Amino acid sequence: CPLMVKVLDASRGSPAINVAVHVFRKAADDTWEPFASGKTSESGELHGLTTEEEFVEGIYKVEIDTKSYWKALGISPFHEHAEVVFTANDSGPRRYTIAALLSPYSYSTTAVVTNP
Amino acid sequence: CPLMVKVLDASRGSPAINVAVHVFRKAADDTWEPFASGKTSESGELHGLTTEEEFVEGIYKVEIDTKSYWKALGISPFHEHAEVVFTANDSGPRRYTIAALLSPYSYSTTAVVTN
Amino acid sequence: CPLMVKVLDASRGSPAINVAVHVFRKAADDTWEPFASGKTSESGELHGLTTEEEFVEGIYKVEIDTKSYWKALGISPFHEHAEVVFTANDSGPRRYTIAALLSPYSYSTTAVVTN
Amino acid sequence: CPLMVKVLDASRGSPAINVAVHVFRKAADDTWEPFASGKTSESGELHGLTTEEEFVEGIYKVEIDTKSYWKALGISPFHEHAEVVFTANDSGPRRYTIAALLSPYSYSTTAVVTNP
């Protein structure tokens, strides 16, 4: 699994469950091409977005749908979503974990990059 | 100032100085139109972005050029930039402070909405 | 002011107002002795904790009563409090801002050390 | 495993490996009694601190030795350590994950509480 996303709820002390995550890859014409999407599990984790074969070099955007998450809990959040944009695999394949921590008016994201 | 942006360097323990920040407002056709911009001061703050008259309800995007910030310090960054996207709702007034805390492989952002 | 503390509510998007903050300095016997204290203002800031003369090099502990803050809002908190422990080293001057960002089950803290 | 600690390095984009973690429990006389200690693995995780039998109700302090971590990397950090203090199991056994994100001048901690 070369790309994993894990989301926690800092406000409620739980995994952020059923969070929609959309991944895009910058195309030759500078537009964002859809790449992969999924939802976090009961543990707040999203595995299986992509494969070693599919996850080529490129600029990737990971958009976490924080707004729908809060609205489903009956909460009016500040942000529309949380975006993480990065260049991947520039010096050969790496494994990326994008960790996100959510509160209605704040979020943090961190990347863990490991050499497989 | 209805909108202020404050950027801190959480790795080196300083304000993030001379960081480029661009603000966009969402247009009817779903494209982003430039709205305000500037560079953070020695205190990491960017004041005077907009006026009460210009800052109407809508969806705003704040794009912080974190990549150039880290490269100017000789430090390899993870992100291409940091984006903060939010809806301004009248409510009330109010005044919005968008704070961003930067590390080479992480950032956090918080909104402070005061009377 | 060589030492300032700023507390923000990351869950509700406001300054954390009227939060009790106690500062201690480490004594020779490894016990914590009270040094300064106060309650955050309407801006979430606590100014005037100490003076240049009183704030010598040493190990300092800042204890923020986050539990009472959340209970006053009717929100169940995880932590008993939030503690920030650090060494003040002359260096240079300098001026220290301890910022804390609070949510019911999380907090972050960053130090900003300016000239 | 009723108590787990996971530590990430936000400055370097890696798990925080070999981080010392000390846990204390508030005693009857209001002193901190040593409870458990360990070091994070290559994945930045620390399992096996305690057991269901040992982890009774109480006020617990989890002290993460962030200073030694940074000093071992040759970095002068701001903080002496990162403390997390909380009341545990007040309404019966729960599983706690304490997640920490470290930078030389900043850290964040979050708790995930689940009902086993």
Side-chain angles (χ1 to χ4, degrees):
Chain A
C1 191
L3 177 66
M4 199 269 276
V5 181
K6 186 174 177 62
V7 194
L8 300 177
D9 183 328
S11 196
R12 295 188 314 115
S14 66
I17 306 163
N18 290 141
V19 179
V21 178
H22 295 258
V23 189
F24 306 85
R25 186 187 173 276
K26 193 176 276 197
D29 60 11
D30 276 317
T31 63
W32 290 109
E33 177 74 6
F35 179 82
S37 59
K39 288 191 168 195
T40 58
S41 66
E42 285 188 354
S43 66
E45 302 193 332
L46 173 52
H47 301 268
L49 274 164
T50 194
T51 58
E52 298 177 335
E53 292 73 30
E54 182 177 74
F55 192 49
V56 295
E57 291 195 85
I59 298 168
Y60 290 83
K61 173 175 83 176
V62 174
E63 192 179 326
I64 301 165
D65 187 4
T66 60
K67 184 171 184 174
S68 300
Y69 174 76
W70 294 115
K71 287 185 73 270
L73 292 170
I75 291 156
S76 305
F78 188 70
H79 302 93
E80 287 300 300
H81 60 255
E83 277 143 350
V84 182
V85 183
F86 64 101
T87 300
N89 307 307
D90 184 44
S91 286
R94 299 295 185 269
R95 292 170 172 152
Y96 300 87
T97 300
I98 305 303
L101 181 65
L102 311 184
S103 295
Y105 277 76
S106 180
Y107 64 86
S108 68
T109 183
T110 315
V112 178
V113 183
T114 54
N115 200 329
Chain B
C1 278
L3 180 67
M4 196 265 279
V5 173
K6 183 180 183 186
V7 190
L8 303 180
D9 182 331
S11 195
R12 289 162 64 261
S14 67
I17 306 164
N18 205 31
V19 185
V21 176
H22 293 260
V23 187
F24 306 83
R25 191 180 176 272
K26 203 160 200 179
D29 65 357
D30 283 337
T31 62
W32 292 107
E33 65 183 339
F35 175 81
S37 60
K39 284 177 175 175
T40 57
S41 70
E42 70 196 325
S43 68
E45 301 181 341
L46 182 49
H47 292 279
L49 279 167
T50 190
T51 52
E52 288 185 347
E53 296 86 355
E54 291 170 85
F55 191 56
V56 295
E57 289 182 304
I59 308 170
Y60 290 84
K61 166 171 75 161
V62 175
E63 216 158 50
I64 304 162
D65 189 0
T66 59
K67 196 181 193 177
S68 299
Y69 173 74
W70 292 116
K71 289 197 172 181
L73 294 169
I75 300 164
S76 178
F78 179 75
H79 302 93
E80 286 299 303
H81 57 249
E83 330 172 75
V84 182
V85 184
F86 67 95
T87 294
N89 182 240
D90 278 353
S91 301
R94 310 154 167 281
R95 295 208 194 165
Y96 298 80
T97 299
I98 304 298
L101 262 161
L102 311 184
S103 298
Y105 284 79
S106 182
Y107 64 94
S108 67
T109 185
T110 310
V112 182
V113 184
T114 58
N115 201 310
Chain C
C1 278
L3 180 67
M4 196 265 279
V5 173
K6 183 180 183 186
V7 190
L8 303 180
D9 182 331
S11 195
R12 289 162 64 261
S14 67
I17 306 164
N18 205 31
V19 185
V21 176
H22 293 260
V23 187
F24 306 83
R25 191 180 176 272
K26 203 160 200 179
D29 65 357
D30 283 337
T31 62
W32 292 107
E33 65 183 339
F35 175 81
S37 60
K39 284 177 175 175
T40 57
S41 70
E42 70 196 325
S43 68
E45 301 181 341
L46 182 49
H47 292 279
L49 279 167
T50 190
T51 52
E52 288 185 347
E53 296 86 355
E54 291 170 85
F55 191 56
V56 295
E57 289 182 304
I59 308 170
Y60 290 84
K61 166 171 75 161
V62 175
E63 216 158 50
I64 304 162
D65 189 0
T66 59
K67 196 181 193 177
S68 299
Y69 173 74
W70 292 116
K71 289 197 172 181
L73 294 169
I75 300 164
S76 178
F78 179 75
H79 302 93
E80 286 299 303
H81 57 249
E83 330 172 75
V84 182
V85 184
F86 67 95
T87 294
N89 182 240
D90 278 353
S91 301
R94 310 154 167 281
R95 295 208 194 165
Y96 298 80
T97 299
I98 304 298
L101 262 161
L102 311 184
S103 298
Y105 284 79
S106 182
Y107 64 94
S108 67
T109 185
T110 310
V112 182
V113 184
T114 58
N115 201 310
Chain D
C1 191
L3 177 66
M4 199 269 276
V5 181
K6 186 174 177 62
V7 194
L8 300 177
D9 183 328
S11 196
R12 295 188 314 115
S14 66
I17 306 163
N18 290 141
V19 179
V21 178
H22 295 258
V23 189
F24 306 85
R25 186 187 173 276
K26 193 176 276 197
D29 60 11
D30 276 317
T31 63
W32 290 109
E33 177 74 6
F35 179 82
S37 59
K39 288 191 168 195
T40 58
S41 66
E42 285 188 354
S43 66
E45 302 193 332
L46 173 52
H47 301 268
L49 274 164
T50 194
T51 58
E52 298 177 335
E53 292 73 30
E54 182 177 74
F55 192 49
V56 295
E57 291 195 85
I59 298 168
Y60 290 83
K61 173 175 83 176
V62 174
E63 192 179 326
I64 301 165
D65 187 4
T66 60
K67 184 171 184 174
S68 300
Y69 174 76
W70 294 115
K71 287 185 73 270
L73 292 170
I75 291 156
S76 305
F78 188 70
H79 302 93
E80 287 300 300
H81 60 255
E83 277 143 350
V84 182
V85 183
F86 64 101
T87 300
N89 307 307
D90 184 44
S91 286
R94 299 295 185 269
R95 292 170 172 152
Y96 300 87
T97 300
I98 305 303
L101 181 65
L102 311 184
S103 295
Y105 277 76
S106 180
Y107 64 86
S108 68
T109 183
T110 315
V112 178
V113 183
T114 54
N115 200 329

